[PDB]
Amino acid sequence: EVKLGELPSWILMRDFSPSGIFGAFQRGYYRYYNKYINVKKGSISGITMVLACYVLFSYSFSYKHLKHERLRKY
Amino acid sequence: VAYWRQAGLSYIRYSQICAKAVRDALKTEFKANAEKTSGSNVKIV
Amino acid sequence: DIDTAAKFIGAGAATVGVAGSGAGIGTVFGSLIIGYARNPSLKQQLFSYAILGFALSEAMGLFCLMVAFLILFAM
Amino acid sequence: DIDTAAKFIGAGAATVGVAGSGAGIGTVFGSLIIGYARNPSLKQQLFSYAILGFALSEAMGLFCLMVAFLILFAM
Amino acid sequence: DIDTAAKFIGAGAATVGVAGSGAGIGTVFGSLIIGYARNPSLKQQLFSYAILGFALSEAMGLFCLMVAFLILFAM
Amino acid sequence: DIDTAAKFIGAGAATVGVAGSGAGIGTVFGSLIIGYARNPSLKQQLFSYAILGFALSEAMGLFCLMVAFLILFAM
Amino acid sequence: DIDTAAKFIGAGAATVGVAGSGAGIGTVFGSLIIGYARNPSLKQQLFSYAILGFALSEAMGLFCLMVAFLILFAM
Amino acid sequence: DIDTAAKFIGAGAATVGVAGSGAGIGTVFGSLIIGYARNPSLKQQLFSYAILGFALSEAMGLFCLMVAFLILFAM
Amino acid sequence: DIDTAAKFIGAGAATVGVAGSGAGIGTVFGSLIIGYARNPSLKQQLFSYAILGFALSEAMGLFCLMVAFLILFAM
Amino acid sequence: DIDTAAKFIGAGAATVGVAGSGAGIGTVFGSLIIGYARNPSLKQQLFSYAILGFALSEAMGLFCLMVAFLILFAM
Amino acid sequence: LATFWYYAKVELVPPTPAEIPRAIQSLKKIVNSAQTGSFKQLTVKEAVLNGLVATEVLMWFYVGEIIGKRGIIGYDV
Amino acid sequence: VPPVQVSPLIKLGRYSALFLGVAYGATRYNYLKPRAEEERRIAA
Amino acid sequence: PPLPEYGGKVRYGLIPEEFFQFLYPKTGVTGPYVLGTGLILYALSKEIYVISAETFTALSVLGVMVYGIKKYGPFVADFADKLNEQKLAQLEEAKQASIQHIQNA
Amino acid sequence: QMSFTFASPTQVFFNGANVRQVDVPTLTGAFGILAAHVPTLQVLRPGLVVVHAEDGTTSKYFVSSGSIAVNADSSVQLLAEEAVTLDMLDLGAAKANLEKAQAELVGTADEATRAEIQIRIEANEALVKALE
Amino acid sequence: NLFASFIAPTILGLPAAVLIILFPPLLIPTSKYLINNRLITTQQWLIKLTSKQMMTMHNTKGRTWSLMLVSLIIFIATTNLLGLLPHSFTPTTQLSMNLAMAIPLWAGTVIMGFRSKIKNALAHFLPQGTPTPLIPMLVIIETISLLIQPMALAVRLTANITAGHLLMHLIGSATLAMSTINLPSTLIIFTILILLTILEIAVALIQAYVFTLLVSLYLHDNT
Amino acid sequence: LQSIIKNIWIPMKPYYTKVYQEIWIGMGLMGFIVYKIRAAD
């Protein structure tokens, strides 16, 4: 996996198919869920990190409207 | 005017049933002595 | 025209007088619930009083819709 | 004319004062239901008080329809 | 004239303040029915309180008919 | 135009008549709580009276939204 | 003048705020009837509470007649 | 423009219809306190009736904020 | 000027919002009479609740006198 | 300007919608007094219901101060 | 509270004039890796790591910017 | 936790870039100051 | 499969401890923090994070979420644990009631 | 100022005692009584009865039926037909008998007999609710 | 300008609104397990509580919708709650979506009340003890009321969640303009903003329970 | 067409065929309503 491979061919070795990216998201989901949520005596931070990643995704598309309230002019 | 009054009961009766059901829900350590002290033996003639 | 225009404000204002019957009708059929919960054997005699109150209340409400239409069309 | 126009708004506004009697009448015939459900043997004496309250309430309501017509026609 | 016209709207608006006494009077003579159904032996003392409440209520109602006529004629 | 302008004030004013049903509906479902807390065995018969009161109350409320839209669009 | 004219509408509108005290005073002297019918031995202590409520209620009512005259004459 | 101006008065007026839900909601959650103080064992069934009354009351309140925004922006 | 004129109508209208506290204060000190007639031993604890209700009620009333003076002088 | 002028009347009118919360808040903290005088052992649970009612009531009141400031400044 | 300065005295210090030859020492190493192009041995894990410290020192430059302008929210003019 | 001395390169980089920022910040401050004053005056 | 007993060891409910220990070797302990204060300062200076009304709505909803967490965290924590043990207790009990029944058989 | 009197056909829980508050399950909804309370008279339904002594301590009983009478001299007389302390009851027999009565209610068809079923139903429901 | 937070968000030209509406379900994990983590423990508990508070009044035919209603209150409550997050786009502020939630469910309910029950359904158009002279006016009342039930459903949600968000945004703007002026007043307005956020949290949950309870009560009326 | 109608169509068939029948009739009534809305716009 990445963090270990150092070949620019790795990017083409992957399966860039609908079922490929689907299983890629499903794996990342179960990897997140199993590490932060699917644990007894778990914590709330397993959720807050999703909200912060959600806020950041929200502030992203909302930039095209928030760049007209700029205080400075440069 | 409660429902059993429309039915034709009386607070003597409402009180008997209520005091009865409260006697049954007693634990058996107390159920016997409390049924004795509150039983009825009179008979109309 | 200033007359055709003022007829809209005048007919609109007089309709606010219906708000009095919206509240008066809620009190009648609210007191019928309370009054019937206390003496349910009088259900038929209580309801007779609710309709009388409902009618007399809405009566004042339609007097407003009267003027609301007396101004909008009859003038 | 600005006078014929303002008469429509003024007569329309004064009609909103009828909303007070729409609510006041609902309270009287609402309390009659509650008061009669309690002591139904006073039915004739309670109703005597409802009509007195109904009249005095609607009295303030017609004082508004007074001005509503005093402005629309008498001026 | 804009003054003679505005006097009609101003006098019409101030009349809406009578709607407060139409409702306040209904509550007084509504509570008299409830209060008398509970303790009918106090009939004479209760009624004494109703008139006091009726007067003080309608007092605020005539203060509006005051301004309604203070604007329409006295100005 | 003075007509297109007055239609906004007239339709805006007639909407205030909905405030009467906002209060009348609160009284009905307020008296249902009180009336049901006293005789909870009549729950099904009380609720039947609340809906009747709710409907008749909101009826006067939609008569205002009637005129509010009769003026804004139908005229 | 548009200022002398608007003073009539502004002073007329602010008078509608007296309708709140017409209703609030009816509730106080209505609850005094109900409260006294239940515990007539507290008549002197209840009445003490009615006057306090009557004063505080009419207080908000005169704040409106304040502005009604602050606009009509003081401006 | 006289249209852009009248939209402010019309949208401002229709907002007054929210005052009906401010009072209707106070009655519902006021009767819930009274109704629960008498039969606290029905707490869950009473609250179910308060939310139903709160929703239906505020429903008429948002119909006004509907027209208030239907006029201010949608027209 | 049309601005100096509209300030009188706007400040006059916002004062009508005091009518809500005239009625809300009457209910608080009306329920204090009823509530104290039932459990006079809680007189000190009931009165504590009346002042809290009186303050919160009149709070909404002064927010209107706020805008009434924010428009008349601060603008 | 006719727009800057109409903003004062529109923002002044929408403030009258606060009168609904002045009355609705008086009913909540009025029923809390009555409801607590009857079952003082529920003091903590009753007060929990008063704050919920106070919040939901004043909620409709601030929606009016919303539009009152949405018109006065945001437009 | 004070433990910040306890650590700051280790890592948050202007570099002594005696360790600057070690700084250019690693500086010549990284340019040597660029000359040959041997950076391809660098698996992405440390590759991101150096990229992160690269963004850090970049941030120190921007921190130097905002204090050079006597303003925080952009240029006050 | 025992601290760790940062490598000299990074520490040399952080402070060198820091001073260049203070140089650049003061440099662009006095560059934008005139034109800002002129466009502020030219707008009215 | 049984569930692990602990989660991901996150700092400030936003950043997992993997990030700090991953950055600990090169720039020590304060490294991740001085990266953060660097990143936020550059964002709010180059107008990446424009200050607006949404800022103060943010500082409020972040104020309640932090308070709501710091107050009712433990209550929801053990309540969830209590619901588990109670289900565990009732179940293992109905494991004994089987044993005793057929043992009497 | 309040002189309480809580008794049963065979037991006197209080007698002229000076308590501060008393909660009772009246047929017209519960209410708590303090000193100088408005004079009233009511009949009870199954439910708790809590007594607050002046020292801030609370005794809890369970009355089945009876009568309450608050008087003009702040003297209360609470006479229950069957008064038991809470710890003398069990939840199982309560829930069990509630089901049997609920079973007999759906099964019954006569008005009067059905009321007696309902009376015993509400008897149990207040049992389980008062117990825990 | 002011209503920027209600415009359909688009990222890189793609309709990012399709992601935000698909997201709230991602916070309800599920497990075949019998004893599981804290999140699913509490959630499994709430879903049981809600289903008991909503579905109890229903007969056997009504409780068939128990999946839909509990899934409806869980989606609306999660969307409203997520919407309180900064810069979020709250898809319940949209009249489009709320219409698409209220129109089907209200229509699905009245239809199943008109297929069967058609003689009781038409009889529900007249209360029982209604007098003779008042019969004809009271039928045109309800048919208009019944017709505005779905409109009331969607508007009660969009207008309550929109007004709530806009209000928090306005007072928030006031604190900003007040930052460079008297500091205690900034603290007061901020305190107002804090108490308002708490109200918006209570309204978010209530509006979900209200929308659902009203769909439920419509369901009970036709089952 | 595998694991789709296996995980999506089987569990919802009890709902998509007899429970939600009146819902779809309503959803069409919705599409017709939004269509007539977006037509006159």
PDB file of C-alpha atoms in Angstrom, chain I residues 18-72:
ATOM      1  CA  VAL I  18     -46.290  47.320  24.688  1.00  0.00           C
ATOM      2  CA  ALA I  19     -49.889  46.074  24.631  1.00  0.00           C
ATOM      3  CA  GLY I  20     -48.449  42.579  24.913  1.00  0.00           C
ATOM      4  CA  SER I  21     -46.898  43.339  28.285  1.00  0.00           C
ATOM      5  CA  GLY I  22     -50.010  45.090  29.549  1.00  0.00           C
ATOM      6  CA  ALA I  23     -51.820  41.788  29.102  1.00  0.00           C
ATOM      7  CA  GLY I  24     -48.970  39.500  30.123  1.00  0.00           C
ATOM      8  CA  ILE I  25     -48.483  41.373  33.389  1.00  0.00           C
ATOM      9  CA  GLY I  26     -52.184  41.088  34.149  1.00  0.00           C
ATOM     10  CA  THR I  27     -52.002  37.322  33.776  1.00  0.00           C
ATOM     11  CA  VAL I  28     -49.002  36.968  36.093  1.00  0.00           C
ATOM     12  CA  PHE I  29     -50.460  39.047  38.912  1.00  0.00           C
ATOM     13  CA  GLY I  30     -53.792  37.425  38.173  1.00  0.00           C
ATOM     14  CA  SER I  31     -52.421  33.920  38.597  1.00  0.00           C
ATOM     15  CA  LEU I  32     -50.614  35.049  41.739  1.00  0.00           C
ATOM     16  CA  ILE I  33     -53.999  35.876  43.267  1.00  0.00           C
ATOM     17  CA  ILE I  34     -55.427  32.494  42.278  1.00  0.00           C
ATOM     18  CA  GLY I  35     -52.284  30.596  43.216  1.00  0.00           C
ATOM     19  CA  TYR I  36     -52.026  32.319  46.582  1.00  0.00           C
ATOM     20  CA  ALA I  37     -55.696  31.816  47.432  1.00  0.00           C
ATOM     21  CA  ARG I  38     -55.067  28.044  47.097  1.00  0.00           C
ATOM     22  CA  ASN I  39     -51.792  27.669  49.057  1.00  0.00           C
ATOM     23  CA  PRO I  40     -51.323  30.871  51.087  1.00  0.00           C
ATOM     24  CA  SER I  41     -48.417  29.316  52.989  1.00  0.00           C
ATOM     25  CA  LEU I  42     -46.276  29.594  49.841  1.00  0.00           C
ATOM     26  CA  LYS I  43     -46.857  33.374  49.626  1.00  0.00           C
ATOM     27  CA  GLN I  44     -43.149  34.180  49.669  1.00  0.00           C
ATOM     28  CA  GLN I  45     -42.235  31.537  47.100  1.00  0.00           C
ATOM     29  CA  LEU I  46     -45.142  32.406  44.798  1.00  0.00           C
ATOM     30  CA  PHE I  47     -44.344  36.123  44.818  1.00  0.00           C
ATOM     31  CA  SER I  48     -40.749  35.211  43.889  1.00  0.00           C
ATOM     32  CA  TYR I  49     -42.206  33.616  40.736  1.00  0.00           C
ATOM     33  CA  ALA I  50     -44.458  36.582  39.984  1.00  0.00           C
ATOM     34  CA  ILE I  51     -41.562  39.050  39.910  1.00  0.00           C
ATOM     35  CA  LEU I  52     -39.602  36.712  37.649  1.00  0.00           C
ATOM     36  CA  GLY I  53     -42.606  36.515  35.340  1.00  0.00           C
ATOM     37  CA  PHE I  54     -43.277  40.241  35.604  1.00  0.00           C
ATOM     38  CA  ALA I  55     -39.676  41.030  34.680  1.00  0.00           C
ATOM     39  CA  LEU I  56     -39.498  38.628  31.736  1.00  0.00           C
ATOM     40  CA  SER I  57     -42.875  39.850  30.484  1.00  0.00           C
ATOM     41  CA  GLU I  58     -42.065  43.560  30.701  1.00  0.00           C
ATOM     42  CA  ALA I  59     -38.699  42.717  29.134  1.00  0.00           C
ATOM     43  CA  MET I  60     -40.425  42.067  25.808  1.00  0.00           C
ATOM     44  CA  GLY I  61     -42.408  45.240  26.427  1.00  0.00           C
ATOM     45  CA  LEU I  62     -39.364  47.477  26.739  1.00  0.00           C
ATOM     46  CA  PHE I  63     -37.777  45.959  23.634  1.00  0.00           C
ATOM     47  CA  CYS I  64     -40.633  47.692  21.828  1.00  0.00           C
ATOM     48  CA  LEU I  65     -40.091  51.010  23.597  1.00  0.00           C
ATOM     49  CA  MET I  66     -36.470  50.426  22.596  1.00  0.00           C
ATOM     50  CA  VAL I  67     -37.272  50.417  18.878  1.00  0.00           C
ATOM     51  CA  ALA I  68     -39.874  53.140  19.430  1.00  0.00           C
ATOM     52  CA  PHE I  69     -37.096  55.433  20.642  1.00  0.00           C
ATOM     53  CA  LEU I  70     -34.399  53.969  18.401  1.00  0.00           C
ATOM     54  CA  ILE I  71     -36.469  55.190  15.452  1.00  0.00           C
ATOM     55  CA  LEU I  72     -37.807  58.464  16.860  1.00  0.00           C
TER      56      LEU I  72
END
